[PDB]
Amino acid sequence: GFLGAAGSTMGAASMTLTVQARNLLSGTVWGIKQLQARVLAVERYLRDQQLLGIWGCSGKLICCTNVPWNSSWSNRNLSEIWDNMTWLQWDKEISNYTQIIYGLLEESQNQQEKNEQDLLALD
Amino acid sequence: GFLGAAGSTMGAASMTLTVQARNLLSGTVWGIKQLQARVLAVERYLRDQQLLGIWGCSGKLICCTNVPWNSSWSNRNLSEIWDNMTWLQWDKEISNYTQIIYGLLEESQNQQEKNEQDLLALD
Amino acid sequence: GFLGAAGSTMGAASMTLTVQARNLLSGTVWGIKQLQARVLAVERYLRDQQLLGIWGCSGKLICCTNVPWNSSWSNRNLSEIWDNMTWLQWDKEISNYTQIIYGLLEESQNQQEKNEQDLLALD
Amino acid sequence: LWVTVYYGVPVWKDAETTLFCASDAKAYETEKHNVWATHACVPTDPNPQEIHLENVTEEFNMWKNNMVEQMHTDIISLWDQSLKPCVKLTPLCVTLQCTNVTNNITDDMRGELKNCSFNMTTELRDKKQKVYSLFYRLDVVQINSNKEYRLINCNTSAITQACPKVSFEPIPIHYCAPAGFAILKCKDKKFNGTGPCPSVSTVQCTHGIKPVVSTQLLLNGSLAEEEVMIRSENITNNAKNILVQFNTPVQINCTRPNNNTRKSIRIGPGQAFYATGDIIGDIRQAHCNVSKATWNETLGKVVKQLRKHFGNNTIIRFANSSGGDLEVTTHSFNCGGEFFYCNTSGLFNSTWISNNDSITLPCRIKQIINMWQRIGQAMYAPPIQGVIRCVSNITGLILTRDGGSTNSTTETFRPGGGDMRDNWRSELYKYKVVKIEPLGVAPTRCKRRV
Amino acid sequence: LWVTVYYGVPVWKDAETTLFCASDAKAYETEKHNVWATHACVPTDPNPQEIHLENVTEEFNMWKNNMVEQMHTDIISLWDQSLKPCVKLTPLCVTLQCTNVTNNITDDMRGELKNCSFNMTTELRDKKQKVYSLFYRLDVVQINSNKEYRLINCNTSAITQACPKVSFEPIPIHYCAPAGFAILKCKDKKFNGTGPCPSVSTVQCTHGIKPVVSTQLLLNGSLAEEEVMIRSENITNNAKNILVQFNTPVQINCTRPNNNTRKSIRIGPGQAFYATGDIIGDIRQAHCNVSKATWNETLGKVVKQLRKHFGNNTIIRFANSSGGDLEVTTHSFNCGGEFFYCNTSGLFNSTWISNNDSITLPCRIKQIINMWQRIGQAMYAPPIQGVIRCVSNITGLILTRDGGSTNSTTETFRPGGGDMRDNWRSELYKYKVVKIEPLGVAPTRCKRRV
Amino acid sequence: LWVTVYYGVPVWKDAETTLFCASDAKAYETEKHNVWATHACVPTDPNPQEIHLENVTEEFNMWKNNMVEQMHTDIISLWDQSLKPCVKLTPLCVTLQCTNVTNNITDDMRGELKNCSFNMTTELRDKKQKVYSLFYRLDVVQINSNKEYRLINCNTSAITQACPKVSFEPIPIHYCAPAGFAILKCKDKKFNGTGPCPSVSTVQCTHGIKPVVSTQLLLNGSLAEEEVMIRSENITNNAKNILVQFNTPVQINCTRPNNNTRKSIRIGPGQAFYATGDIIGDIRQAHCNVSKATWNETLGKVVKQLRKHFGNNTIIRFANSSGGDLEVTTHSFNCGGEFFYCNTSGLFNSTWISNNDSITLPCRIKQIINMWQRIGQAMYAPPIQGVIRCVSNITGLILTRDGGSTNSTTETFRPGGGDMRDNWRSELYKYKVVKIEPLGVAPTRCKRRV
């Protein structure tokens, strides 16, 4: 269900990716209460949708990138993350590099990628 | 024009796909009247955009899927649908399976698909 | 920065494509002042996002098309545009054909394209 | 076969939603400090699109059309919100020292006015103001030395004056659907307002509808094409209203044949009450004229149509109102900002089996009114000096039918109304709101890749 | 390894946001012209989802939960916006010619009412109205020939009457998070409201919470599971309130044993003041009953729990209020639209070392109140004729502890409260709002193409 | 070549839109129950970004800049919405029994105050209150036994008092564009406000602008860089205002050399009128000081600049106001919550061909004002006891030019103003709003696939 795998491992929590993006939308004062909330609800959806878009993905759920993992980012092995760890605990670590990693995606990639495609599309 | 082929056949109504998605956006009380309406107008756009996204399409207009057609879904032949029928009359039939078919798209496909791509992308 | 290359050449201004789409979102009366503004802010984002979508792109930044350039559109050579000109000065020219060119993208292409793909996907 | 999703498919279904309004570019230019409501609305489309939906049949129900209800609630709110920053007359409830019109020679309509002198507040909380005004009988009621009087609302509600800046003058209003929604418009000539339409269109906005508030007679509305048309919720239910739409308009000429005086009485600070000064002219009861021959041509055409519902050769009777509140026993409407109440006995008094000057209605003017059966906001309309004349098109009727049947033998019809929702229906009958759902999923021989 | 973005990951963190309300389908059907607020809210979910978050532990803090604050501000606004279109009693500040109850035989509660005759405005600004009403001592204050009196708010604020249409009757209200946000719900049986929860769930809406306004005793709330539970912000801080939640409910039976009269006094135009007519019955002080044995079972269970915090074998003392505003020195609540103020000395007067009829509280009724420490909107509740009785469940307490320690020797407890925020906390303790951020980025052996 | 769409291209064009405000973090901490408006605004950006637009030239027009209009309408609304929950003084229109200042020795400014005794309402609708206050001549007007007086607004509008909680004290306000829009900022040192800017920037917010309301002299504004700068809509149109911006600020020292008394008069229930008690001090006309030498240095620099527009060697004359409403014939402003009206004859009285103590302005204080040419909301500012002193920077002027030419011979200048829109322009001159359109389509040798 909603936040079903929230406590499961990150590799297991990859199954509930469909549930989180699904319920992320849901379709005289005291009526404006819900208005201003559901306005922000849209804005929160589009923030991530734009980030997802301006990066190497723009398709939802999963995408890969050409950014190499900086191993000072608190490195653990592939079995020490997906099958040893939960996403919330994971967000409790890379929180510092979150703003840092995001930048490498939008500029260092898609601006590089789609311009790399410009000079190779001319023929 | 707007709802031009609404009365034509489903195969013919596939031509007016461009007109429907186009005009689907259009760009002190009594001003909030239009506000709350045009807020919902956005929300209605994003509901379908998200469904379209979380399914095997995310590109607009047309997409295919790997879900086989359950022939108890009120089966008719390909000439008995596209060239014999109108979309409204068609929506007057599968209305029951609408909520049912939609589910097979988001979970049984993209969660299956993009995870099927995960283990084949590692090499 | 924001509108950094706004004065540079169109070929140079292609580098700041990432900055413009980024800051295009940013995340009792006198509170509704910001509300109605940020509502329209969403609507302005989705207008272009839909146009971008219904055309041959739907991925952001750059896309190409199968529409041939009508040379009465105020033709200049490829060195007389990208490396000789600024985008604002460029928008000061094709402003007439803007509404005209946009139409060839949504209908004459994607409605043609994705239907051309329909009859070739059946096998 | 495989499921295939299609975006932007022509799918819709009946729905109710919140609409928006349009009112030209011309209705804003009128200004005069926001006449009616048009201050926040957006412009009407110069080139409104009406698109015929080829080979489309759709069911409509004019009696269960939420557009009607939305308009009703809007105009209520509009009235409510336009009278609030205006002058508030609550101190105007004061013992009224009042006599009959002094008259002269001789007697025709006697007590239509009073001379009412009252102690009133000035700008200041100290010294009173002993001054007077003119008032109609419908405005003022006696309660028991000369006779003693008070305002007719004083035991009912709260009075506050229409601001002289704004103006009650219908303008055309279009109602429009937001994105994702559409208005369907039935174009068949003969249509009773309920059932399947063969020529259906979609529009962004309705036609321009003047929110004309009136009873018994529908004024300045749309006429039915080629033939007078009858619309009713249940023809055998004597409790249900019957709406009539004409083919040919009937001119109606009304006048207030009294030049008047605007006497500004200062009940400050800042609040200015406009009193009725005197009468410049002979003392004349207003009246409305209809062409007898024209009215008779209309009645001939209306009766024949009614027999198709009530059966082939029956007696059709027209009679006056059965009783009830003043709002429903007269033809009420407004002219030059003034409220007319007209006796329609001369209009509804005829018997038609299957096989020429002026009709004058003895109208009466009331100044204090509270429509829409609201109790607790009273409104006062200040006198508009000068000769008041207006000319309108009678374009429809609101009628009722007697219940004592006579069920296959004869039918009797009387003017009726009172529920203003019926007025809106007569214009909105051809419209309904639907929501769009651009998704649809369909089988075909296409499948996606691995 | 390469960075990989994942959309819709179960990530959240504490956040404060604007919530929305739900109130069944049944709470709208009640109608009576919008009882409480439910006019704009959306419906409660028929099948609310509560999802256990497997293997999830989350920290909660009931004392720093913005849901509590939002509810508080909402009900303030609600009260504020529901009394504005209603009758405004500002002219009711008038010299009150007032005597004691005439009484008869003999003396029990004497001055609980007055007979107050006052000059008052009619519909009109001319002739006065010399008429009277009944008023409680808590309503009216003397200021210095018979004694002279005035309303107790007249030097404080502005009076305006509760509209007889609406009704102060708590209904269950659910609070819900918008999209992108979620409510987490702690399900551990023994939970003090602050710390890590082992059984956490997520819900769209809270349970239905009746916004019962009361002091000293919590009524009709949720009870703690298996055992009486104690919640306090700082047990060693004598300035901090202590919230108690019971396991077993205690029935409380209250009555206003006086049939009354609704005497409608017209202070127009349109404004109708409902006066208190007379007493039909014997003149009886209201009262609330609790079962002595039941109350005693409760006190036995409450004391034992307190010793776990204050240590093993110490004396626990219950005593009455220390003083302060009337709102905090009595148990205040409402019944049948009427405001009760009850002496709780009989409830809080016992000493418990470590090892049967009715309790009657001498309540008093006030009609003029201004809660939430607001100064400048006064409210008047009109009399509700008839026998007024109510039965509630005492489900919790708001207590304070003396500061003169006696720190390891004995403890003394007194009823307290006054900050209504503490009432909301007792139901919302198990909820907190968090925001969702469906992005997350992770290393793996996948890289994209050229 | 083939069409290629590019998203996020640096395209913009002039547009008008709805802006939002920012006001630091410090302007909220001020509190005092929401001083000015800052209660709903968002915080200013700590690190505002101003980005130079390299090699960009843009046309600006400070006279047709909708930012100015939006600010104007906002501050109007602000004033309107901040005086509504406050005390309403409508009963204060009462016959005023009023004498001159008794004076003593001898005569300097005589009738600047009155002693006004009036019958007033208490908390109650019965017994009056015979009490008094002090009032300025500008506040009160006579109408024809000692002389009889009334408030100057009583025939104009409705009075209601500024709530003593809030405070009219400009704070810096930034104006900001929402997403999809941007503010362009011209940075050229010499710029008249209309034409092409060579150093253009984009910002999220304007600089912090104090909404200082004043006439004739601009106070605490921005100064022009290196040189005094002149800005006018049409230099040859004698009907157009001329805005002057200084390079060097001029200190202005004002004082109300009277200790005062706040006498709280209760006009209840709940409404408390603050009367003016008495004078503690000698009876002294307020005054504003400017340094003669400093003022003279300024005038020297201002005149030379004017000759570049009016031609090389002409006579420049400064003279006092030509007449008109009090708002434009004095330098008006506020200090310590009090409204000063200052005679500027001593400031504008000089003749400058091409080749030291204090200036004292005989100010007058009015308490009742209604700015923005609004008729129907009056406002009363209560006395602020104590010595009132303030010091401001004169940073600009609003001037007019005589039409009787003398067209190439000489020019005469007088202080002017009255349209407060001109005040906002002097700060906003370097800003304009534009909308962004991230689409653009361009030819290249790239085409897509089949």
Ligand SMILES: *[C@@H]1O[C@H](CO)[C@@H](O[C@@H]2O[C@H](CO)[C@@H](O[C@@H]3O[C@H](CO[C@H]4O[C@H](CO)[C@@H](O)[C@H](O)[C@@H]4O)[C@@H](O)[C@H](O[C@H]4O[C@H](CO)[C@@H](O)[C@H](O)[C@@H]4O[C@H]4O[C@H](CO)[C@@H](O)[C@H](O)[C@@H]4O)[C@@H]3O)[C@H](O)[C@H]2NC(C)=O)[C@H](O)[C@H]1NC(C)=O
């Ligand atoms: C069904 O439809 C018909 C026609 O569509 C409609 O008839 C109209 O009646 C209204 C009155 O109810 C008329 O409106 C008034 O007309 C007079 C006369 O207008 C003449 O001049 C204009 C040129 O301006 C000509 O085009 C026209 O043909 C006439 O020769 C005007 O004087 C009235 O103006 C006043 O009212 C306005 C709106 O209320 C105000 O904005 C305006 O300021 C005026 O108010 C003030 O005027 C004075 C200041 O000078 C002041 O002293 C007064 O005290 C007052 O406060 C008004 O426009 C309208 O013209 C008629 N239509 C036509 C085509 O002539 C029926 O009424 C309608 N049926 C129903 C039931 O409504």
Ligand SMILES: *[C@@H]1O[C@H](CO)[C@@H](O[C@@H]2O[C@H](CO)[C@@H](O[C@@H]3O[C@H](CO[C@H]4O[C@H](CO)[C@@H](O)[C@H](O)[C@@H]4O)[C@@H](O)[C@H](O[C@H]4O[C@H](CO)[C@@H](O)[C@H](O)[C@@H]4O[C@H]4O[C@H](CO)[C@@H](O)[C@H](O)[C@@H]4O)[C@@H]3O)[C@H](O)[C@H]2NC(C)=O)[C@H](O)[C@H]1NC(C)=O
């Ligand atoms: C803790 O929780 C308990 C129970 O959950 C609660 O007890 C409830 O007390 C309230 C009073 O405060 C009761 O509400 C009133 O009940 C009487 C009697 O109801 C009988 O009839 C119904 C059938 O309709 C039976 O189901 C029921 O069991 C009883 O036998 C009603 O007469 C009252 O109606 C009036 O108030 C309504 C709301 O305020 C109005 O909508 C309604 O129109 C009535 O108002 C008017 O009525 C007359 C018109 O006929 C008019 O003349 C009057 O002047 C008046 O203006 C009201 O519903 C409620 O029933 C009790 N609960 C139960 C289960 O019986 C405790 O109060 C609560 N604790 C606290 C502190 O609140």
Ligand SMILES: *[C@@H]1O[C@H](CO)[C@@H](O[C@@H]2O[C@H](CO)[C@@H](O[C@@H]3O[C@H](CO[C@H]4O[C@H](CO)[C@@H](O)[C@H](O)[C@@H]4O)[C@@H](O)[C@H](O[C@H]4O[C@H](CO)[C@@H](O)[C@H](O)[C@@H]4O[C@H]4O[C@H](CO)[C@@H](O)[C@H](O)[C@@H]4O)[C@@H]3O)[C@H](O)[C@H]2NC(C)=O)[C@H](O)[C@H]1NC(C)=O
């Ligand atoms: C152009 O710009 C200049 C400077 O930028 C500006 O000068 C300022 O004038 C205003 C008055 O209009 C001054 O504001 C008042 O200042 C006094 C004195 O402040 C002293 O103390 C502070 C420490 O707190 C020192 O930092 C400062 O330097 C002074 O030594 C204050 O006493 C005033 O407080 C009252 O007003 C506040 C806002 O209105 C209220 O929030 C506050 O509660 C006070 O109100 C009440 O106070 C009493 C309660 O104790 C009560 O009894 C009173 O009746 C009253 O109701 C106020 O802050 C400001 O300080 C000056 N600026 C500087 C730097 O000193 C010019 O005015 C400006 N030009 C124009 C035209 O505006």
Ligand SMILES: *[C@@H]1O[C@H](CO)[C@@H](O[C@@H]2O[C@H](CO)[C@@H](O)[C@H](O)[C@H]2NC(C)=O)[C@H](O)[C@H]1NC(C)=O
């Ligand atoms: C409405 O009809 C009445 C009656 O037909 C008209 O009254 C006439 O008025 C004129 C002059 O005012 C008199 O000379 C006639 O004697 C009246 N009666 C008749 C029968 O003509 C009235 O003028 C008409 N009003 C309008 C506006 O046409």
Ligand SMILES: *[C@@H]1O[C@H](CO)[C@@H](O[C@@H]2O[C@H](CO)[C@@H](O)[C@H](O)[C@H]2NC(C)=O)[C@H](O)[C@H]1NC(C)=O
């Ligand atoms: C609450 O308790 C009091 C006291 O126990 C009850 O008062 C009794 O009332 C009856 C009839 O009204 C009398 O006959 C008794 O003498 C009273 N006292 C006792 C001790 O019974 C009162 O009735 C109770 N109220 C309710 C609603 O139960």
Ligand SMILES: *[C@@H]1O[C@H](CO)[C@@H](O[C@@H]2O[C@H](CO)[C@@H](O)[C@H](O)[C@H]2NC(C)=O)[C@H](O)[C@H]1NC(C)=O
């Ligand atoms: C503003 O200027 C006037 C006049 O220059 C000053 O008035 C002086 O006040 C002092 C004491 O108040 C007297 O001793 C002087 O005789 C006055 N006149 C002169 C010429 O000095 C006034 O003090 C100044 N105000 C401020 C705040 O500086």
Ligand SMILES: *[C@@H]1O[C@H](CO)[C@@H](O)[C@H](O)[C@H]1NC(C)=O
């Ligand atoms: C609780 O109160 C005590 C003193 O009563 C104080 O020392 C302590 O810091 C407070 N907070 C705690 C214990 O978290």
Ligand SMILES: *[C@@H]1O[C@H](CO)[C@@H](O)[C@H](O)[C@H]1NC(C)=O
């Ligand atoms: C300025 O005013 C002059 C006359 O004073 C007029 O001729 C001219 O058109 C106006 N506008 C300009 C110069 O732009």
